[PDB]
Symmetry: C3
Subunit: 508 residues, 3 copies
């Protein structure tokens, strides 16, 4: 801001050419200004979604922004209604053989001895019976002649009878003591097989109890477990089905947000145009009176050229002016000067310009070439040549534009990144559930149930007897009759001398 | 844009009535302009959420938009602080009977034969003993008289004794061979029952091994599986809970977004009003000087009325002017003309209007009725009658309004639809887990354990008896005394002639 | 709006000092106006996300909002291309003893009786054999002398033989009947043990079938269940993995939305500045002609000072005026009045101010001190003193500021709160899966498998022996030779008188 620049040199003494109107021609202008606008309501639902029903249902939850934006576009406080609705969701036998061999005679001399008794085997053969029965008879023959015991021959018969009865006795005694052994040991064995089958019955019973209980346990587990999976199934379905819903909504809400902005852009443009319409209405107030009620002394304002008269008329959202004016039909370039500094005495005009007919300056009217003479009534004089310099920099407003960081730097201010563990369950396939094989033992049991059959005793039929071999009381006197035959020969030997008469016949 | 319209006919030549001020009255106006604007700040959290704590937290994640919007409302780049905080999350017997029967004494003639020996049954009856013992005795009687073998009668006694001993021999031999058979077959049977019970023990043992191993396997599976169902129970619960968080947040963020816009509307309105306040401050600069430092030549500027003087008074956020003016006390309608075309020579005024006192035109001052005479110093003259036509259509800016498609057409540009399969698990209820039934066999086994009792052998007591039957050595000479009695009768028969004397008595 | 205020007292009259220019000085001003604004294209992706790739992808779904905002900033309907791309996702024995005691003599008199037969025990002792064999022999001695039955002595031998054979018969018969009993009861017992082992085999077979069937059932369940837990593992992994994704996106979209606004703020500021540039271009149209094509009669307009001439030049995005003017170098305070009411006749000036040299008023030019005399050609006169009052309150537009409720009250209009049940599965640990204990019975069965080993009968060896004691046919005549020895003594007793000669020797 200097009070001066140079000496006798400035734009203020530029002295250059400039067009001045010389002749004129009648003119008119039609000038149009808008003063009002068609503020119309906008349906956000029609603007953002249009006809996309999977959006129409969601945009509703965003709120009454639609009203806020319409309150802006249209200067009408919409008198909305009131609604109270809220959703709510709730033995000796061999030894006798070995010693006697095949000599039937050695029979009695081979008699063995068990304990305090003499024994023989119980079998007489045609050789032995010949020996003893002819010995018995010979002892009965000799005794009739011999003075004493011709019956010394009968000892072997009477003894071999006694010894054999003893042999039978010792052999029956053991047959019986064997019978007591086989009876006791079979009684003891069936006592132990009775225990065995009580124990097998108890073992089979216990197995049956558990195998059945555990079958029940598997059934119960299967009933519950197959229900549990049915429950897991239903629950995972609800989740997947809702996750899918969320994956539709979380996409659709992003496009809606973009359109919400795109709508806020349309709204902002309308307000910006509304401020220009209302500035054009403020301009129409000056423009209408400075010509209609008055006459403007300006240029190009309210009608191109120099304003004279005006006739206004209306339009649907505006005013139209049929202004009247005059314009240069003919105009000429003249060397002119804002000021002229004479010997340190700056000189300028009053209500006009300096213009130069070649020989000297005149003052003239800026907008009509009519030279006038220079005088104090027509000019100003200043004792200082120096030219004052001003500066006027019309800075239209510089907004404090937003100052966003990188997105990462704002994100990490509050964003919690996340990664849940890769969860897994415990493998049950380590369960072996071993099977059983007893088919060897079951086939073996069948084998012995078949083979026990062979052991079924099949003795050699002996026979009991003791049937009807009885004599009758009516005939029992049969032997008494024999005694009567002894009486009959008692007459024949009434004396023995008849035998002596037969011995006399043996002599003769 | 025509250089002409018609001949002697235009809005420029048509003369009509206009209101010219005739008398005046002193006036003032108070004119107010707001030059300043207290741009107050705004708390987004209070604006969007207010007091809804389930929202206050969400706004933090949105970012510092609140600052960006306040930098717009205000004009000072708020000097915010710096914070470095980041969350982080990590036998013969029958045949002897059949042939004998009960006839006399066929006993010996009925003797049978096994192998090379003759046999009889071992039973003598009072009938048979009478036959044989009286036969034996009769053979001892006859032999005393008969010259030879009267003992032919003794053959049947001596033979039947021998045959019976044989019968007893053949019947003992088999009684022994039956005894060996019974012993062997019982020894073989207990050999097979020993195998059977070794097998049964092996079968029961291995069954016990598996049933008990499989019980362990069920326990182990139940321990793991019941833990496993506990794990999914905990994991589903997280999924469910975290989704409750999502389904709340994904709803609440939609209403927040609507308010974010509703806030961007408030902010936009403020900037729009800020631009009008700053345009009103630009208008106050012209209005203040054109009337304070100077005097305006306009009719309605600085308040309706011809401005004369001004006195400004500062206001907190505006400026108040007490302007001084004059207004038409009396005004009159006059037929006036912008121009008048005389014989092809268009004619208009200088710094005024044409006005018509009935007989002829005058020039006058537009805003005061003072008629003046027409002259070149007071008017302009043209050569051409033709009227030039201009058009000035003040189009306030038409913005490039947004050009959104249907929502569907923008959605399908990037939207993915995702329907996951209706997942299901495999039904385990095809597991039958059969049960076991051994009752019949366990019952049968306890019934044979009861019934084996009947087989306990109960033999018929026989008796041994081989003890007190021993003669003493002190008395054994008892039979030697008998031999001494034989010596005593040896004197009585010292000769036999004493028996002859008794036979002589039998004669007499 | 009053037509009057007071009498002889108003701001229109109250006079006071004012600064009128007295001397002047040549001046210039440089005045700058912008008339154009660079409409640059802004990349939303660079503005919102910058370089954060986990955001760049999301902006795609946000749709063509970037174009809508650029259409606003840059008034150019960008001719975008067309793309058709859509993603798609598809016995008697004792009794004989008790009675006979120790008397070989009581032998026969102690014979017992079973049924219809007499019995003795089958054992002869050296005492009994002495009795009977010496009785037998004595009966053969006596019978040679006695007239009749000296053989009465032989009854006891012949009877005791018969009775003992019976004793042996009754004792063989019962031994045979014991043998049948044991055979039958062993045959019946092995018949019942055969049943038992058929039943044990059936029981073991049925326990093998099920235990092995249930092992298969456990295997099948384990195969399916371990697959089923694998399927769950995979499905819960999807849910979680995709939920994590949603928890990233639902956070990141909130910061994006905040920047979307922060961007809509930048865009709004640009439009606001664009409206001021275009208002500055509208101001440049008046400013350029009122000073270039003409000369303004206003104050401070076209730079400080009274405008005289102008020289315009271009600017980067505006216009620069080198205006020429004059300014007060020297100015003086003067007591001046807009109007002066003389005796009810209000009086004001024409095209100037009243100024007061001490003695009286003058009219003068507002912007130059040159006193002039008061006259009707230089002033206006009114009839009424009364001062008219106007008011002009320039209300810059008051917008319909948004009218948001509390957030809760808008939220509850459509927000559905949701709390799913705390789902749980049914506890399977109530499954007992009882084990089995059979050891006692298996050890008992192995102990009997060893116990019966003793019951193996070990009879007392008896012996058969029906071997070779046979006589040869070549020697059988041995006893016939005995008959020849009987013939040899038949000569010695050819008569008995030789025995009589020996009895005569017994006499002598
Ligand atoms: C710039 O404007 C100037 C103002 O008009 C012009 O200069 C003028 O020129 C005229 C022409 O002579 C002059 O007129 C008078 O000059 C003498 C008195 O000053 C006087 O002797 C003249 O009278 C005689 O001449 C005329 C014919 O010209 C005869 O009719 C008379 O009978 C007599 O013989 C006459 O009165 C002006 O004085 C003079 N003015 C000034 C101030 O200069 C310039 O011509 C013009 N520039 C250009 C380039 O044209
Ligand atoms: C009327 O007022 C206008 C409103 O302020 C002024 O506009 C300003 O003009 C200046 C200078 O041109 C400009 O400064 C920047 O210009 C470059 C583009 O923005 C930029 O590269 C510059 O940076 C360089 O220069 C500086 C200074 O030497 C260094 O510190 C830097 O390191 C770098 O080398 C510089 O920052 C303003 O941006 C601009 N403001 C606006 C809002 O337009 C007019 O200049 C003024 N006219 C006059 C003289 O009346
Ligand atoms: C539009 O304005 C016109 C301008 O004022 C008016 O016309 C004027 O009318 C007057 C009245 O006569 C006239 O005055 C003179 O007329 C004669 C010379 O032109 C002359 O003879 C007159 O003098 C005689 O008459 C007067 C009385 O009127 C006597 O006092 C004298 O002693 C003498 O006897 C007088 O000087 C104007 O000349 C005339 N002007 C013009 C240019 O027309 C119109 O009346 C007015 N329109 C309306 C509708 O009123
Ligand atoms: C001053 O400038 C204004 C700014 O441009 C002009 O406003 C324009 O005026 C025209 C005509 O009224 C208008 O055109 C449309 O008008 C109807 C409503 O928008 C619309 O239905 C029209 O469509 C019909 O007519 C055309 C042409 O025959 C056919 O092609 C169509 O098929 C259909 O039948 C037409 O598009 C502009 O919208 C409007 N623009 C703006 C931004 O206001 C003034 O007309 C102008 N005044 C003058 C003459 O100085
Ligand atoms: C406000 O402006 C007023 C206008 O200029 C000033 O008043 C003026 O004062 C002068 C000075 O006297 C006066 O001049 C004449 O006064 C008489 C006729 O009215 C006449 O007698 C005077 O002539 C005599 O005096 C002079 C010297 O002054 C001699 O040269 C003469 O030879 C003779 O002897 C003279 O013509 C004005 O009339 C008068 N005007 C009015 C309307 O008042 C004021 O002075 C000024 N205010 C201030 C504070 O200065
Ligand atoms: C030029 O037009 C301007 C635009 O309308 C007017 O501004 C208005 O001025 C009034 C009064 O100052 C103001 O009213 C409110 O002022 C307070 C702050 O907003 C507020 O507390 C007031 O409330 C109190 O007073 C009322 C009335 O007695 C009671 O009902 C209330 O209960 C309470 O006690 C009052 O509401 C407007 O807000 C304001 N409007 C705007 C948009 O600026 C200028 O007053 C006007 N100037 C003139 C006189 O030409
Ligand atoms: C994206 O997937 C959506 C399912 O998740 C699918 O919605 C389904 O659309 C079909 C076709 O419109 C509907 O089928 C029936 O819909 C109504 C029923 O009254 C009828 O008007 C139709 O004619 C048709 O019979 C399904 O009911 C519907 N499913 C659900 C759960 O809403 C969308 O269509 C898919 N979008 C695209 C672009 O493919
Ligand atoms: C929507 O459901 C929300 C649960 O999903 C529920 O939040 C719950 O609100 C109750 C009541 O405020 C809380 O109970 C306690 O909250 C604090 C605990 O310190 C106390 O101040 C309270 O007095 C009360 O004892 C629950 O803790 C809370 N649950 C959770 C998980 O945050 C909302 O209230 C529900 N909203 C509506 C409108 O019903
Ligand atoms: C005006 O221009 C003329 C040339 O046309 C020149 O001679 C004269 O000195 C200039 N005057 C001033 C004051 O610059
Ligand atoms: C201004 O000062 C100049 C130089 O002294 C002088 O010539 C001129 O007359 C003065 N103007 C006024 C109105 O006093
Ligand atoms: C499964 O069987 C293998 C061999 O077949 C054995 O090594 C392992 O110990 C068994 N595991 C279980 C739990 O039975
Ligand atoms: C002006 O109006 C009058 C009628 O009052 C008419 O006679 C005259 O011709 C008009 N003049 C023009 C130039 O239109
Ligand atoms: C303009 O032209 C007209 C018609 O020829 C003429 O009468 C008039 O004098 C001219 N005006 C000027 C200032 O040359
Ligand atoms: C289940 O039992 C039915 C008959 O009861 C049979 O047809 C089917 O094969 C069995 N399935 C299994 C796996 O045991
Ligand atoms: C002007 O001020 C003077 C005092 O300087 C006073 O005498 C006079 O009455 C005032 N005039 C008016 C109209 O107020
Ligand atoms: C206006 O009225 C006043 C007061 O009656 C009077 O003196 C004056 O001459 C009138 N002015 C006009 C132009 O008629
Ligand atoms: C589990 O065992 C307990 C005792 O050990 C018993 O009371 C209960 O009934 C059993 N439950 C099942 C299902 O076997």
């Amino acid at each position: 801001y200097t009070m001066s620049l140079g000496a006798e040199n400035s734009v203020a003494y530029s002295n250059n050419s400039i067009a001045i109107p010389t002749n004129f021609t009648i003119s008119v202008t039609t000038e149009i200004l808008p003063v009002s606008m068609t503020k119309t309501s906008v349906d956000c639902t029609m603007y953002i979604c249009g006809d996309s029903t999977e959006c129409s249902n969601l945009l509703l939850q965003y709120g009454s922004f639609c009203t806020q934006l319409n309150r802006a576009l249209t200067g009408i406080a919409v008198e909305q209604d009131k609604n109270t609705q809220e959703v709510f969701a709730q033995g000796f036998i061999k030894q006798y053989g070995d010693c006697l061999g095949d000599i039937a005679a050695r029979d009695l001399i081979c008699a063995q001895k068990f304990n305090g008794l003499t024994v023989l085997p119980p079998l007489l053969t045609d050789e032995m019976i010949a020996q003893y029965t002819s010995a018995l008879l010979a002892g009965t023959i000799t005794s009739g002649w011999t003075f004493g015991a011709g019956a010394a021959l009968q000892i072997p018969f009477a003894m071999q009878m006694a010894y054999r009865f003893n042999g039978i006795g010792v052999t029956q005694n053991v047959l019986y003591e064997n019978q007591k052994l086989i009876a006791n040991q079979f009684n003891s064995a069936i006592g132990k097989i009775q225990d065995s089958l009580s124990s097998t019955a108890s073992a089979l019973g216990k197995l049956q109890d558990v195998v059945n209980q555990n079958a029940q346990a598997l059934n119960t587990l299967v009933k519950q477990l197959s229900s549990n999976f049915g429950a897991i199934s239903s629950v995972l379905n609800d989740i997947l089905s809702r996750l899918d819903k969320v994956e539709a909504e979380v996409q659709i809400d992003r496009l809606i947000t973009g359109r919400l902005q795109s709508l806020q852009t349309y709204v902002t443009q309308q307000l910006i145009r509304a401020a220009e319409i209302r500035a054009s209405a403020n301009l129409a107030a000056t423009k209408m009176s400075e010509c209609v009620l008055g006459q403007s002394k300006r240029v190009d304002f309210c009608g191109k050229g120099y304003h004279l008269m005006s006739f206004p008329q209306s339009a649907p959202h505006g005013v139209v002016f049929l202004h009247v004016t005059y314009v240069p039909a003919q105009e000429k370039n003249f060397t002119t000067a804002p000021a002229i500094c004479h010997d340190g005495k700056a000189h300028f005009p009053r209500e006009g310009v300096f213009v130069s007919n070649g020989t000297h300056w005149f003052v003239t009217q800026r907008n009509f070439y009519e030279p006038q003479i220079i005088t104090t009534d027509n000019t100003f004089v200043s004792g200082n040549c120096d030219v004052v310099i001003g500066i006027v920099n019309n800075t239209v407003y510089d907004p404090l534009q937003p100052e966003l960081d990188s997105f990462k730097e704002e994100l990490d201010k509050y964003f919690k990144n996340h990664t849940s563990p890769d969860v897994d369950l415990g493998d049950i396939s380590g369960i072996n559930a071993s099977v059983v094989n007893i088919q060897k033992e079951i086939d073996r049991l069948n084998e012995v149930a078949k083979n026990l059959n062979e052991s079924l005793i099949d003795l050699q039929e002996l026979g009991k007897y003791e049937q009807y071999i009885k004599w009758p009381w009516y005939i029992w006197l049969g032997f008494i009759a024999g005694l009567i035959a002894i009486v009959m020969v008692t007459i024949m030997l009434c004396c023995m001398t008849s035998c002596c008469s037969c011995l006399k016949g043996c002599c003769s």
